[PDB]
């Protein structure tokens, strides 16, 4: 299986953060082929100092 | 496209209401279950209620 | 590209904008106005970086300028980004700017009562 | 008597709508010719779809 990376363009004033977050939710809700309803909001996100700033 | 439009953005940014706050900084996923996800995106505007 | 916080005042920011526009540069930020304009006319301008644009396929349907010596009728209200689009369009059409009426204006976004005084270039 | 028309010019961003509304109110208040105080804000206005939009 192939890994996925989500690119937050935090250096661009016209970046679309909402699109990236929606992509993150959709990957979780789709690629988890458990055969049951999945809630994508229940995810952990560990972030680095520079990214947080 | 509808959510990103300037006309809706400015109005809901200016409005001071729990609905306005939720739809701008909150989560739009508040619908029912379609069988693959627990909630579906929902947006309120002009009385109509859109769904994805 | 106009770097962030490059001017201490809107009065100098407008001068820089006009000077850049007279050099053939074009700008368009209608879609993300919220993230460029600072809070007031006395803060540091602009809030964030503004990038040039390749094309200027824009033309107001309403008459612009309102008259020979005034961009908008006194007291007109318009969206802030639209003011910069319209002033740029007017300058492209050979007009030149004397002063920008912003002394007593209070609010910057999303609507403002900005106006300009025009003349003929040489 | 002669009929009156009021122009709003809603297509022009520099229109003065309040001026037209005051004109309508003043006409209603002044052309009654009944010798009594009159409130010009008690009037109906039926509007076409294009005009409303």
For residues A24 and A4, give the distance between their C-alpha atoms in angstroms, rounded to a whole number. 9
Give the count of Cβ contacts less than 8 A between chain A and B.
23
> Is residue C31 a contact partner of residue A14, using CB atoms and an 8 Å limit?
yes
How far, in Å, are C57, C115, D24, D33 from residue D37 at the CA level? 56, 42, 17, 10
Method: cryo-EM
Number of continuous H segments (helices) and E segments (strands) in chain D: 2, 0
For testing the chain D interface, which of C65, C73, C78, C86 should be mutated: the one with the most D CBs within 10 Å?
A: C73
The CA radius of gyration of chain D, in Å to the nearest whole number, is 13
φ/ψ of A9, rounded to 5, equals -90, 65
Contact A14/C at CB under 8 A: yes
For residues C58 and C28, give the distance between their C-alpha atoms in angstroms, rounded to a whole number. 10
> Is residue C88 a contact partner of residue C21, using CB atoms and an 8 Å limit?
yes
CA distance B36 to chain C (A): 33
φ/ψ of A26, rounded to 5, equals -65, -40
For residues C68 and C71, give the distance between their C-alpha atoms in angstroms, rounded to a whole number. 8
For residues D41 and A39, give the distance between their C-alpha atoms in angstroms, rounded to a whole number. 56
Which 8-state DSSP code applies to residue C112?
E
Task: Report CB contact under 8 Å: A37, B38.
Answer: yes
Strands C95-101 and C115-120: antiparallel
A-contacting residues in B 6-45 (Cβ below 8 Å): 27, 29, 33, 35-39
CA-based nearest residue to C109, from C88, C78, C87: C78
Per the rule left: phi > 0, alpha: psi between -120 and 50, beta: everything else, A3 is beta
CA-based nearest residue to C104, from C93, C115, C90, C120: C115
What is residue B18's three-state secondary structure?
Answer: helix
What is residue C60's three-state secondary structure?
Answer: coil
Sign of CA dihedral C30, C35, C39, C44: negative
Which H or E run includes C99? Answer: strand C95-101
Tell me the β-bridge partners of C119: C96
Lookup: tokens for C25: 């540069």
Tell me the β-bridge partners of B49: B44
- Among the residues of chain D, which ranges form H helices? 17-30, 49-52
> Is residue C6 a contact partner of residue C19, using CB atoms and an 8 Å limit?
no
For residues C109 and C49, give the distance between their C-alpha atoms in angstroms, rounded to a whole number. 17
Angle of helix C80-92 relative to helix C10-21, nearest 10 degrees?
40
> Is residue C74 a contact partner of residue C66, using CB atoms and an 8 Å limit?
no
For residues C46 and C37, give the distance between their C-alpha atoms in angstroms, rounded to a whole number. 6
Lookup: tokens for D9: 């010019």
Which of D11, D12, D13 has its CB closest to that of C78?
A: D13
């Amino acid at each position: 299986v192939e890994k996925k990376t989500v690119y937050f363009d935090l250096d661009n004033p016209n970046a679309d953060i909402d699109a990236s977050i929606e992509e993150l939710r959709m990957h979780m809700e789709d690629e988890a082929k458990t055969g049951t309803v999945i809630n994508g909001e229940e995810i952990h996100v560990v972030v680095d100092r520079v990214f947080f700033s | 496209k509808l959510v990103k439009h300037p006309k809706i953005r400015d109005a809901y940014l200016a409005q001071q209401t729990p609905l306005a706050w939720q739809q701008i900084t909150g989560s739009l996923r508040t619908g029912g279950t379609d069988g693959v996800q627990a909630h579906m995106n929902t947006f309120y505007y002009g009385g109509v209620k859109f769904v994805q | 590209m106009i770097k962030a916080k490059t001017y201490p005042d809107f009065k100098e920011f407008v001068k820089g904008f006009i000077a850049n526009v007279k050099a053939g540069k074009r700008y368009d930020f209608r879609t993300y106005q919220e993230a460029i304009l600072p809070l007031t006319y006395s803060s540091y301008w602009p809030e964030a970086d503004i990038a040039e644009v390749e094309k200027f396929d824009y033309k107001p349907d309403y008459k612009v300028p309102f008259s020979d010596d005034l961009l908008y009728s006194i007291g007109a209200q318009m969206r802030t980004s639209d003011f910069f689009m319209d002033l740029q369009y007017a300058i492209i059409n050979g007009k030149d700017v004397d002063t920008v009426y912003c002394e007593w204006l209070a609010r910057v976004k999303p609507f403002s009562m900005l106006n300009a005084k025009l003349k003929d270039a040489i």
